[PDB]
Amino acid sequence: MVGGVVIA
Amino acid sequence: MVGGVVIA
Amino acid sequence: MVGGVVIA
Amino acid sequence: MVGGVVIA
Numbered sequence: 001m002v003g004g005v006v007i008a
Numbered sequence: 009m010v011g012g013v014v015i016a
Numbered sequence: 017m018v019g020g021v022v023i024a
Numbered sequence: 025m026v027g028g029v030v031i032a
Contacts, residue, residue: 012019014032020030
């Protein structure tokens with residue numbers, strides 16, 4: 001699993 | 009700005 | 017699991 | 025301004 005999140 | 013990332 | 021929240 | 029982030 002590779003995963004990523006942003007709130008900008 | 010909030011970020012995060014994983015493996016795995 | 018990867019989660020993120022902003023209030024602003 | 026309130027932010028939060030997690031794994032996992």
